[PDB]
Amino acid sequence: MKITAIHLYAIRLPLRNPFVISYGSYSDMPSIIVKMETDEGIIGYGEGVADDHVTGESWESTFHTLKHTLTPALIGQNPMNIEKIHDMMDNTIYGVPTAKAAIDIACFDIMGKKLNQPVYQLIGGRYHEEFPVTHVLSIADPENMAEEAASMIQKGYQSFKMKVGTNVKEDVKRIEAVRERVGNDIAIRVDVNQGWKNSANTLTALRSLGHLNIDWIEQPVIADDIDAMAHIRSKTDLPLMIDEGLKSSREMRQIIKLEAADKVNIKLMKCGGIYPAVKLAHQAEMAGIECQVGSMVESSVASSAGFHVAFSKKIITSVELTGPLKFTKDIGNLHYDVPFIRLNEKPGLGIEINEDTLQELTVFQDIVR
Amino acid sequence: MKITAIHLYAIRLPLRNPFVISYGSYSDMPSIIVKMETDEGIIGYGEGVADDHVTGESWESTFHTLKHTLTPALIGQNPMNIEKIHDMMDNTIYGVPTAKAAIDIACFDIMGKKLNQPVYQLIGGRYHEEFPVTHVLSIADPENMAEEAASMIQKGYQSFKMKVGTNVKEDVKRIEAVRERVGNDIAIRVDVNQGWKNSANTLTALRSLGHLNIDWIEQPVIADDIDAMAHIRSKTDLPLMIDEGLKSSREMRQIIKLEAADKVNIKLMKCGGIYPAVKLAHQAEMAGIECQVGSMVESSVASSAGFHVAFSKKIITSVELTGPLKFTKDIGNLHYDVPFIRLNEKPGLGIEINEDTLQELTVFQDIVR
Amino acid sequence: MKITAIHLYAIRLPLRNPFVISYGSYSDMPSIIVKMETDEGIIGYGEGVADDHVTGESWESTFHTLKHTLTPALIGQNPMNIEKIHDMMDNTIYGVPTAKAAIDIACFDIMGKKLNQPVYQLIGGRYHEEFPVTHVLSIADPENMAEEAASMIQKGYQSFKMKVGTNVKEDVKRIEAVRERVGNDIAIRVDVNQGWKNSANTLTALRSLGHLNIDWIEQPVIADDIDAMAHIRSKTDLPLMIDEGLKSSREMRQIIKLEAADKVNIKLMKCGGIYPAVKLAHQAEMAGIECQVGSMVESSVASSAGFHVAFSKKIITSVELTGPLKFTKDIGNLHYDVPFIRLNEKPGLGIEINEDTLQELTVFQDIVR
Amino acid sequence: MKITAIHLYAIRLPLRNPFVISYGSYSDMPSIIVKMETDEGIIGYGEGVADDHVTGESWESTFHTLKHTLTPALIGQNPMNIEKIHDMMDNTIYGVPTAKAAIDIACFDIMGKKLNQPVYQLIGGRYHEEFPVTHVLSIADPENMAEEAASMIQKGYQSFKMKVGTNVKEDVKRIEAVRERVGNDIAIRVDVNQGWKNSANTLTALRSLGHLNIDWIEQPVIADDIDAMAHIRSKTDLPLMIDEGLKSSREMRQIIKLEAADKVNIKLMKCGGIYPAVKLAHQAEMAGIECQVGSMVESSVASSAGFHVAFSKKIITSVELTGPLKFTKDIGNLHYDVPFIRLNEKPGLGIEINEDTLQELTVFQDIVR
Numbered sequence A, B, C, D: 001m002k003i004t005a006i007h008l009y010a011i012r013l014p015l016r017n018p019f020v021i022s023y024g025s026y027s028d029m030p031s032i033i034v035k036m037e038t039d040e041g042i043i044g045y046g047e048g049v050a051d052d053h054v055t056g057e058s059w060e061s062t063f064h065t066l067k068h069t070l071t072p073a074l075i076g077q078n079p080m081n082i083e084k085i086h087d088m089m090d091n092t093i094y095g096v097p098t099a100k101a102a103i104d105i106a107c108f109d110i111m112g113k114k115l116n117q118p119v120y121q122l123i124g125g126r127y128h129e130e131f132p133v134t135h136v137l138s139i140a141d142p143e144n145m146a147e148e149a150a151s152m153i154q155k156g157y158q159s160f161k162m163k164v165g166t167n168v169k170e171d172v173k174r175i176e177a178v179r180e181r182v183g184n185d186i187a188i189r190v191d192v193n194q195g196w197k198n199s200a201n202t203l204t205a206l207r208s209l210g211h212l213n214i215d216w217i218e219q220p221v222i223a224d225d226i227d228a229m230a231h232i233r234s235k236t237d238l239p240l241m242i243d244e245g246l247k248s249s250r251e252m253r254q255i256i257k258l259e260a261a262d263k264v265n266i267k268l269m270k271c272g273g274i275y276p277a278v279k280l281a282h283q284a285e286m287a288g289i290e291c292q293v294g295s296m297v298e299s300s301v302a303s304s305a306g307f308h309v310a311f312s313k314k315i316i317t318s319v320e321l322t323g324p325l326k327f328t329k330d331i332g333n334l335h336y337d338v339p340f341i342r343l344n345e346k347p348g349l350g351i352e353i354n355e356d357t358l359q360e361l362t363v364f365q366d367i368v369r
């Protein structure tokens, strides 16, 4: 098989409400979509949604490194040889995981369609039947968050994720707020997106959260400080999860060596797609580190890609890909049986792309052959 | 898909000459072959060749743990879900990698045949085109080994592996013997199969081998002593490879933590097959540890299984599966283009089993449904 | 002071001869030039030359992250507050050191012009009077390199840098070749640009280079493996320098902690400019790690920026910015008194930009206000 | 530019009230002032206030090492080359940070005046707009301290620093005293100036201070024991700050290596001035250690010098230079907008020296040319 052409679509996925986190507010979500054509007529879709604050890739920058750097080197290349495809990309350019993920995903889509089989079947088979979905509450006021949780509660939701990290004294204020508001049977996990910066602030915050029964604290310090994470872990009994601090096997190695975390948040956009994500899961498994497959706010394309990885691995015990249900328009149709996700048995990503929706969301595009 | 029956064949592969190593001599090679039947009529072949001295599994013991423990729990199970298949096996019994490998291989064979694709395509695609084959010289006298190398030299062979480990003063005697005999362009690697026992003996031996230009020393100390391996590595500039010291991710973790080796020898029979072997490769990759896929003396069935793993991974840079060309009868037809191995494009293991040869080599058998 | 506009020029600097290294060959050098305008009429020039293989930034990608991400956030911002400028950039996007360097340099140019003083005066004053220039010999055949050195020898050159890393047995072949060719008074340093990959290969190579009197070995293993670097350093007496393995303070911290190197190669394009480079020098100083300011093949703009950092710091003992003398056309006029570099006393970068040359080299451009 | 002469003034700054700490009581504050003259008519002021108990420098000793050792070697030297100036001083004499600070400050004053720009503009630009000022309560009785805080409370003050360290059982007595007295919104930090000596006493004291909500504990053990500091940090969740334990990069390196502190108190008098202080800030930044610029009780001269460093660095988050507002007479006019400090835009230290006040406070003097 040979790649004959690659279409690049710089689109914008509309959000029902502004997504608010520690380092920024989002009114919508820019994304790069790729359509990969092969000499065998089989086509695959991939997606790259860049987060400037995490991987240093932007919407426009990703579009262009795909256009001028990665795609030209991929024409004529075989999408069935995933290891080879990644070797070529890594050799032509270092890093740029989001751009590489977009290509990786399309290759697996093509692979699955070609073998008339869902992606998870190409990376280990199906292991999970379903995963519960947890509702992420954007940074809001103590009662505005306690309330948004009250609503989702009466819709089946069993667990929530509170985004905090503006001010320790305030973030705490919001926690017991929703904890009290939802009883003591609703699971609660908190993500501070580096908001507490260092171990001193973090440890101070944690002493005020021991009675609230939090499942785990996610990335409390700045991404680059894995050392701080290990120091925190040495003085607290609250499970710790690393997110921005983990991108590729490079930091995975450090996390294992320093025993910096109880769990890691793997995101296709941080490591370069399905294949690299599988490698991370295998690495985390060796050290008994539990994994989660999270994501940037992504369309059905990347989201399903993430679920396929999740559904195929026993070490992946939680999932956080809810972009498709935050947008008012999606170019794909990944179906959620809220409060659960179950994958169908369809080939490739098991998704259908609405050409009309894609085209109306496209701000600019190009084709490379 | 569902497993409907599993046939177990306890066979014996005849050897052209006695295979001699540090802890034993072999006149032939006992092996367990498995034929897996599915409700879809698709059949797969797997193989388990036990080495009592390495994994504590024997020919008969493997046959029986397969018959009474593993196979009954696998009937009705789906061979397409490799992760699930291994989860079931691990849950019913700990360890027993050789027995599990036999089942793992048959599942991949079925998977490949089902998707009309070679195994390597299911675990990363094709990465390598070919690998050079190195000739293993069994433990013999200084001139008997120097000679056997002289022969293979004039047949294309570019690299050899000397099996040593009876007596340091003697093993050394054999090395310069063949080194001198073959010039200084022929690659030479030495495997002592734990023969030197500890770091003191090993370090003494190594000082007498610095001028001979050896590619690497393989497993010089007793398997369980990873610490000794790291100590040796701290005081020598000769690359070190761990073989018997590595079986599953359990020791891989220790090897990475202690920086005990430059390279590892992965064998499907030590870790439980293709899937576990792929996980080891990914783990070794995180630490920059080069991998080799070696083997016990195996028929075409396990041997091809090993090659499929090797051919799909950039981190695997050398290969050592030469059983098919040491036997006078093989139940399979894996083709070697000595001094190279190249895999064909056929589905599954890309091999054909000669029922007649299988049956004449079978000493006893059973079927489980 | 306020930034009123920023012009972006995607140019291409023509090379007299192809620049060859371990991971690629260059016929010319793509670069992004920035012209920063202020409400006070003072203008500054900056430059960003991306190396896809090191920081994962490309020519086009850098142009765009500058255009759509960094520059819009900088309009109205004060270029005199360098710490503030960097805070703004880091807050809007993570990494992207080459793009940030382009802006950093223009700000210092403006700062120097504004205070009618050379850049080095704004970062510690002048410390060095001059630095010797060493000639870099691109990867060639053993005698083609021995020869190119013979030539430069009779032009004043006192030290050379051999680019190697294709094959250990070959790279070595080239070393004694030029060493023998130039006597034993000519300094020789070797850069393998990750070519030997790991410590095993590296240590093997090093034993064959002990008699050649090499000043230091530069980045012998893959960038991400700082651990391998420390392991190598524990078993060799040859000074080691880290290049690609060092980008920002993030790896500097690791290098210090693990004692992975004797010296580091700081490049404005890897850390984000003059200010971050000064911080690295201060950090390296705390651990007694000697520094060198090297570079990507850059025009007079970034090259002088690098020299200003070098000339102001006692801890920086060698310099490697020779792009201006490899090009057949330069947009600036940095003057080299081969075999030495001395900086003038002119304000800012102390350079003059030839508008005509800039414009003829520009492939595409834009302006942001 | 060239230094033509250096005037040394041994003065005494009168204190409104006796300053009491763990290891001594002060009725006034001896200080050494330097006036540096250049061939360009530009003059700069510097200051050195020695603390015998911290750096082993005394009022008279500093005056003389300046007179007979440092100044003679500086005549004819260029004050614009700060890196060079420090190299010369370090080469002529080791340590003596207070004496060197006095010279360092005058050089920056001259530099700023020469470039008609404030000092902070020469070391990174302006980053901060203002810093809150915290009121330091000298060692007194439990109610005498609770009271002094009650007063300052009704003057805008938002945070206080309690000097303790005479007796654990007593020091604690004073803490809840003022904590109770000022409510739970007033920030409180405690400095024991080595008073608890070791980790045993310290850890015992800390268990009795967990409920009082202290921002951080400063230097609880003897200066030289960085190990004790790390041990304490391993068993407490209270942020720890090192003061006397930190002087130059020498101990900064140790603090980073052993993870001995959450924050450090940088003082120009302990490291040799503005330039060395900036280097410490950059070093602390690499490890994510927060910095504070504190001081000995200093006049407007050194105090402004300290603020210029503070205002230019994001890593410096708190400030403690309140000498100008403890004296009844100051030779300078640094203006405080209690409870805040904001620096003006004037060149150099942005201060004016009252010759008459200087002269009446001078006990003895000399001039060196």
Ligand SMILES: [Mg+2]
Residues within 6 Å of the ligand: A191, A193, A218, A219, A243, A244, A265
């Ligand atoms: Mg997160």
Ligand SMILES: [Mg+2]
Residues within 6 Å of the ligand: B191, B218, B243, B265, B294
């Ligand atoms: Mg072996």
Ligand SMILES: [Mg+2]
Residues within 6 Å of the ligand: C191, C193, C218, C219, C243, C244, C265
């Ligand atoms: Mg280099």
Ligand SMILES: [Mg+2]
Residues within 6 Å of the ligand: D191, D193, D218, D219, D243, D244, D265
């Ligand atoms: Mg203090």
